[PDB]
Amino acid sequence: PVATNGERFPWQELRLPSVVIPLHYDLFVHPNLTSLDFVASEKIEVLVSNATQFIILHSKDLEITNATLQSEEYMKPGKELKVLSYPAHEQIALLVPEKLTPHLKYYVAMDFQAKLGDGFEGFYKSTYRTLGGETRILAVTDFEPTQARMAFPCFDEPLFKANFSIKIRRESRHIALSNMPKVKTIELEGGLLEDHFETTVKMSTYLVAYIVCDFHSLSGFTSSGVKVSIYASPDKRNQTHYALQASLKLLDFYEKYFDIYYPLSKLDLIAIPDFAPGAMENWGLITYRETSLLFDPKTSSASDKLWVTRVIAHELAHQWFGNLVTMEWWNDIWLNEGFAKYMELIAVNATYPELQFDDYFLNVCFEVITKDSLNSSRPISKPAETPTQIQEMFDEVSYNKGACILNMLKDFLGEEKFQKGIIQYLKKFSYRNAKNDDLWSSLSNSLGENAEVKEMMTTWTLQKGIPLLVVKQDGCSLRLQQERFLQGQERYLWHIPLTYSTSSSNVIHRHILKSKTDTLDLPEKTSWVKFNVDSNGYYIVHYEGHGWDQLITQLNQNHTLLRPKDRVGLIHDVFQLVGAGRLTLDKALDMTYYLQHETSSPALLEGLSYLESFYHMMDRRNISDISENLKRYLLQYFKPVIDRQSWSDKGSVWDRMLRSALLKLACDLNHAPCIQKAAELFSQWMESSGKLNIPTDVLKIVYSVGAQTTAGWNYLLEQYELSMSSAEQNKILYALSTSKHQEKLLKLIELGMEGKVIKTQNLAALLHAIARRPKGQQLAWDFVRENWTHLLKKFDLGSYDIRMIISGTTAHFSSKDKLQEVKLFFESLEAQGSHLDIFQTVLETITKNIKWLEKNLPTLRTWLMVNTR
Ligand SMILES: *[C@@H]1O[C@H](CO)[C@@H](O[C@@H]2O[C@H](CO)[C@@H](O)[C@H](O)[C@H]2NC(C)=O)[C@H](O)[C@H]1NC(C)=O
Ligand SMILES: *[C@@H]1O[C@H](CO)[C@@H](O[C@@H]2O[C@H](CO)[C@@H](O)[C@H](O)[C@H]2NC(C)=O)[C@H](O)[C@H]1NC(C)=O
Ligand SMILES: *[C@@H]1O[C@H](CO)[C@@H](O)[C@H](O)[C@H]1NC(C)=O
Ligand SMILES: *[C@@H]1O[C@H](CO)[C@@H](O)[C@H](O)[C@H]1NC(C)=O
Ligand SMILES: N[C@@H](CCCC[NH3+])C(=O)O
Ligand SMILES: [Zn+2]
């Protein structure tokens, strides 16, 4: 059946017919940034394979005002077309006056027009503030996955690749950028200019990009000769120096490591003021939030440098993983994002081992594990339909899990072989698509005894959840039993590569597992064993018997005898098993004693995290007596290291991150001295009128302290609008989130709604920040629940924005009462609401919360009191 105002639709499927295959777009956009809209024409060189009457492609909010098919053989210029718009599938069918013929090349041509978008999607309008307080406008695209069609009509599936020839018309006040380099710029009649860009290589629609704006750049060349340029508001060209250095080191590494050159003459990276994702891998023109690309030493901290390094690396890696080789469809999106998420590790560990991103990467893995230990989780690879569904596909799973099961795989196979694995894969599908199975098939084949790695990774990508491996030790035999891990089913098995160590030799014993159960014998009775070394593998281990107690003693006697990743891992698994019911809370809490001997910031920081977390559970909930004791326990223990910390920025990355960590905890716990220090720095900074320089590492801290007085918080807010640093602003915003006055918080949320002072793009993060504080957890929940309508105007569901605006304000709940209001709110969301897999997850998570409490609350109380004594 069909629409719009009559007639019927030749196609009842939201996928496009393979019959009409596109080979080339000729695309021309004439935007106006006063008019705030664009006119455009396109020209598509199709090729039919089966004769047909109609031609089917995507379009969304596009007014089409001319449609013609032309002929190469057949019909000279130019037969007219009958345009049929079926919005429910964001499609339009073309009607021909005569059957088309197989095996020949046609030309589809349309003129179309629209206003620039309001969103962060399609061909939208963004603004920024100048050093002089001027507000300026730019026009910009963001297409992944299904918004390419909101800009120009086209065959908008990742498989229909093509060459794109893009022409942009613009006033002289502006520049035009697009994926490719710029051939010529002809001056049109009355002043207006027109830019012609190099025809692209073959590539999917979601990767087309074009921008008009008046940014300035910083250019440089890679050893292999690409012109990397950094782009950003004119008053921000100084923040773009690091982006350049890194881009460069990083593209070099990639071309070498992948052994495949970056195809394009130049690569661009631009800092977009209003930008929803963190960044976008548009071939040859990658877009970034300012916080993901800009860096100013006066204002950007270590973690900052690390973050932007990360994302720059993550995005260059896409030029290969996704760009050059694209997953065939959205179910295997993980192929792009999981592989890119991983390569981050390799390249950054490669080019910047001083960031020690290695000791970090695990966090990626853990944090997903937290989400993959619920029934409401899913497989890395899963089928996808509605645009919305697809948007959901961009999550912690496709990213982190996919990235985690890759580093695990790499461990089993070895870098040498693994690296070889990918150079093959990439080279094989250069400039084309590839399937889920394709990856594995090309990795596992890097006689005649056969790499069956397939079967293995196949159980990983195709079933929900994560494995828990319990081990029993009776002298010299170990009972390895596997199960699905859950946080308080049947029918799951994993070809799960095991690893472990023994007290004696610190040598690594490997051994694969595929049967539900198996046993193994130990060449010498031993003290303790430790499965999953360096935590390089995607599963949990439980130690029944004295297995846990042994390892914990070891930790108190001589922890160095344990891998600092094993140490880090043990801490993870211990605390996770408490939730898993397998353990009692005192055992974990007890491990956390040896921490006064721990110097590995990774482990030390993890440890504290769990401690610091319970404090925040206790605090939200009114639960005074425990939060107050846990506060006292933290200030008391750990006081040595806490007292050692400097209000400077000296030391390695981990060193500075640990400082920020500690000094924060201290001040967040009202530690008399520390907060005096901060309050002083702030009062100097304010009364000196910005002049004083607060070290970037205590910056967020000082600001948030100073934020408690009405004087400060008002100066911080005004200072916010005036800041030329996204990073500072970021930290200021947080600092404004630490106020105790409801109205003050409410203000922020409104200012973020308005989107003038506080960019809408910050609304979720902001909400989330408030929701965490005791004071704001209600304010926040009221607001979302009360404004779901207007919010849904601002953002798509399910954008990461909506997805996070939902969980951010509710996932932290842990009472019966609230679990209802949420449960009931999600029922309510059921019109345009229903349905997001986040609805589920959030509930399951709130429940888990409630449980942990009743199950382990009292146990926490005593443990603390046992210390007081
Ligand atoms: C968008 O339209 C604006 C109209 O505001 C154009 O600017 C006008 O252009 C004509 C011819 O160039 C001039 O006579 C007017 O004086 C301009 N108005 C202003 C405020 O200067 C502009 O050319 C268009 N932009 C593009 C590149 O299409
Ligand atoms: C469209 O894109 C392709 C590349 O994606 C252009 O070139 C071919 O590129 C492949 C892969 O690098 C080379 O092996 C071929 O030698 C290239 N072919 C030719 C004839 O140059 C191709 O030229 C572009 N075609 C269009 C429609 O412009
Ligand atoms: C990181 O890089 C170093 C070389 O700088 C290498 O020795 C190490 O194995 C790498 N780590 C991993 C696990 O990729
Ligand atoms: C662990 O502790 C012992 C006893 O304090 C200490 O002598 C030693 O440095 C540690 N073991 C080694 C040599 O790593
Ligand atoms: N491709 C993006 C994700 C954006 C998804 C929404 N535009 C990335 O590398 O993170
Ligand atoms: Zn990505």
UniProtKB/Swiss-Prot annotation:
Post-translational modification as stated in the protein's UniProt record: N-glycosylated.
Residues given in the record as substrate binding sites: 144, 278-282
Cofactor-binding details, from the entry: Binds 1 zinc ion per subunit.
Residues that bind Zn(2+): 314, 318, 337
Record flagged with keyword Membrane: yes
Active site per database record: 315
Cofactors demanded by this protein: Zn(2+)
One Gene Ontology cellular component annotation held by this UniProt entry: membrane
Further facts: Defects in the expression of this gene may cause improper antigen processing, possibly leading to favor tumor escape from the immune surveillance.
Identification of the protein by name: Endoplasmic reticulum aminopeptidase 2
Source organism per UniProt: Homo sapiens (Human)
Gene symbol of the encoding locus: ERAP2
